[PDB]
Each structure stands twice: as C-alpha cells, then as structure tokens.
Amino acid sequence: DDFAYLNARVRVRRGTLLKESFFQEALDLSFADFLRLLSETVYGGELAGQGLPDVDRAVLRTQAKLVGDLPRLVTGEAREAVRLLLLRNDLHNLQALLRAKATGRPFEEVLLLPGTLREEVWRQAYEAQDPAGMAQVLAVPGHPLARALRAVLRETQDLARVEALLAKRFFEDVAKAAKGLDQPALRDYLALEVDAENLRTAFKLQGSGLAPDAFFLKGGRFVDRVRFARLMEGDYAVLDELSGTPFSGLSGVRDLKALERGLRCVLLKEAKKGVQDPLGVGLVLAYVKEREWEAVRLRLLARRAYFGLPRAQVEEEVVC
Template identity: 85%
Template structure:
C-alpha cells in the first residue's frame, strides 16, 4: 500500500475501464428480462449472477459493487485511505437512512438496495432486525461506527422519521466537511460542499411548511445555499432555485416536487463528480469512479425492473439518463 494516491489511482484507472458503456444501457432499455440477464452476464457483473430472478440481479449488483468499490480503502493508506473512507461513509449514511425507512414502513430487508460503504451487508441486516432505532444505533456501535453516536444523539431530540433523517445528515455532513478540509484535497472538498447544498435542498423540500428550528436542520459548509435561501425554500419560496443560475445547480429552476428535485440533483452531482477524473494525482479520480459506479448500479436496477415487469421504455428512460 502507498501513502499517496499513486498506486490507488492506478488501480482505479484500470477499474474505470470496466464501467459499462452507454450503448449497454441503450440496448437494455428494450430487452425482455431473459435477454437483459444475458446482456448482464456478459458484463463485469456476470460472475456474481447466480440465478434468474429479480432478487438475483440485485444481489449480483450489490456483490459486484462491494468487490469493485468496497475494497478501495484497503488499496491505500494515510491521506488516500481517509479520502476514500469519507466517500464511502456517505454511502453508510444513505444505507442507514434506507434501513430506518424500511423498518418504519415494514418493507423487507431484501428490498433495501444498499450502496457499497464501510460496513458489510450482514451488519446492515442485523441493524434492520434490531427492535427499534435505538437498537440500530447499538448494532452500529459494535464496529465503532461514527453514525452510531450521531443516531443516538438524534433520537434524543426527535422520533419523527423525516426529522431523524435530516438531523443525521446535518451531523454527518458537518463532520465530513471538517475532515475534508484537513485533507487539503480541493476536488473532494468542493464536491462535498455541493453535497451539503444538495442535502439542504432535499431537506427544505421534505420539511416544507413544517415548524422546525432552522439551526436544527440547516447544514453548514455548503457553497451556494445559505441559511437565508434555505429558510425561504422551507417556506415555499421557489424563486430560490432560480437564483442558483450560474452555479452547478442552475438546472433546478422550475422544480416543484421532491421526486424531480432528486432526479436533477443526482445528475448535477454526477456531472460535478466526473470532473474529478482530471485530478489523476489526488482524490478526484477516486471520487469520479465511486460516483460513476453508484450511478451504474442505480441504472441497472431500474432497467432490470423495467424488463422484469414489462414496463414501457418511456416509463424509466428519464430515470436512467442524465443529459
């Protein structure tokens, strides 16, 4: 292992060569499920495919992502390892929020689509099987995960799921932003600041019209969404989105619902992450790769469902294409 990004980025460059081409997704949008399975089996995901059902596809994608992304921290040490850990901790937050949501709605664990993070699937299953959210925190505390303390603190303030998610994000992102500054990696620092902006926008949409303390949910560390804009959007002032013209979030103008916001934020952040590929000696290349793999997995799962349920192409096309 190396203390800088040299060895890690050499491995990442090789793995970027296995990312699926756009032609794969264009072809997959019109295939039957058996033909989709055939196409997938010929890709880097094929060696993980052990069955012919939809859950088998999800499991194959999850295992491949763990193999192609989850091992990155072991390929480096020092600053390079810490940079990768910060990226994968972001996925841990997403997984924790998904677990809490699934427990709250009674959705089975098998339907929770996990991202490659620092924790293995078995531990997330234990978290899901915990009696309540406090039990989830206890499971996460076993490996000493920082989200365990964050979740315990949040649960002392509220039991409302939407607010729990918002407060978890606040504590997570503010901690990560501080850690990124210490690393002195501009590509990673700037991207994480955009993630803070994106999370503030999501939170404002989710909690719109509710009486919530601003300081309790607004996340510091963003670049373009300050406290004033956040407060205005929380009150339903959509002109805030028009004011983001000239920033990476210019494409959000006209958005009025959470689903559309999520879709446009996803494409915006992917575009910004990909710019990191021009940073071959720092964390930017790893950033680009990790986010490209996440997007790939999301597209594959959506297309698998289109093929399995026989949905028309138009029903998923907007969800699997970023302009």
C-alpha cells in the same frame, strides 16, 4: 506522496465499463435479453441467473468487491475518503438496525450493505443492548459516526430523535473531517454536497412551513438559512435565484422528482471532473459515482424489461 499504486489499479478496473449504447439498447429489450446483456457485462459475472432479484443482488455484490474492500489498503487521506463513502452505507445500516431494535422487530429483520463496518460488527451492534452500548460498538471501529452517536446519546437514547439530530450532527462532523482532508475538489464538493442536501431537504420538508432553523444543514454557498426558509414556505423562486450556479437546471423546477433528477446529474458532472486525479481519488470517486449511475440504470431498465414497462417510462431517467 503516492497515489500511484491506487491509480494504476483503478484504471484497470475502469476497463470493465460499458458502452452508453447499453443503456440505450436496454430501452427496448426483453427480459431474457436483459439477462443476457447484463450477464455479458461486469456485474453480470455474478448475476444470480434468471429473475429481477438476481440483478439487484448482483449489483450489490459486484460493488461489494469492487469498492467495498478498497479503503483498507493503506490509510492515507484518500483511504479515509473511500472509508467515508462506505461508511454512508454503514450509516444507513446502523439506522435500520436502530429502528429494528427500537420497534421490537428482532435481529432477523434487518439486512445490510457492504461497508467499512460489516456484518459481525452489526451483529454485535444489534446484540448490544442499550443505546449507550450501541454507540460503544461504534467505538469498536472508531469513526465520526461513532463519535456522532456518543454525542447524540448524551441527551437522548431513543431512535427517532437520535437519528434526526444524528444525521444533522453527522454531516457537520463529516464537514470538519473533510476540512482536514485536502483535495480541493472534494472540499468544493462537500460544500455543494451540503447545498444539494439542503435543497432536497428543504424541498421534502417544505410545506412544513417552518423555520429554516430546525434542520438547515450548513456549508451552503448557493444556499443559506434564508433561502432554506423561503423554500420551506413553498417558494420555488428560491430555485430561480439559481443563475450561473452549477445547479442551474434546477431553475424552472417545481417538483421534487425533477429537482432530484437535475441534482443527481449536476453532482454527477462535477463528480466526473476529478478524472486522472493525481491523488487518484477524484477519479476513484468518479468511478464510484458513475458505477452508481450505471447501477441505478441497470436496475431501472431491468424493471422496464421485466415488467414490460413502456420505453417512455425510463427514457426520462436514464439520461444525465
């Protein structure tokens, strides 16, 4: 056993969190007040001062310290889990890098998030020449993403496919690793995470009109291949088969935006459940998720003030 140490610290970190009324207040504020308001709250303590970019950058940097260095600090299951989150940031970074490399668009042109894998690794990764080499750079830290690339490489070594098939392959990989990781809530969440991803994937790629089979992500349980197929045909009645599911507000939805809105919140309510997680990481995950939802909002509301946008413009999107 032992999440004790994690748990106490994170609870201390949870102290820096804001009132709901912040997000409400923000609805009507000016930019100067926006700056003041953020600067008085925890991302604000590295706020780069005046201006919208300062906000975005602060949000990133604040998460960089509060989340980004967490996985290292022993290496039990949970520690791996934190590693997975930060690894998603890496995965994007990698994709971007791949594209940069691929598109004849040099080293300079990429900038990346915090993660388990960090600047120097990336710098090497870019600076690795061959697609074989890139995957081998990934072998430097050793990750299911590492594994995913090497596996992806066997057939093909060029960006677009590599990425597509990788993403699919990767999510399959995460799933297995996750079967080996044994928080029941996360196990359920993974299946649902799979499902959510399918719903949105199906949604964006609907009107391709194609088979479910080309990109049916797997581990669905409010979803299966047929539903996927159906939705891809245009069919929102797939969403209307939602009935008693966690995803229940997605019924009556027709558009992707609204779909996403519902999803983000559904996943959020579930994500918030893990609170006083015994092994901490329900709670840590939740703390993270909330920080996101908060973070997103800081930025939204920031734009709203900054550009002098209507209240009604964010009013939709600040509520879960």
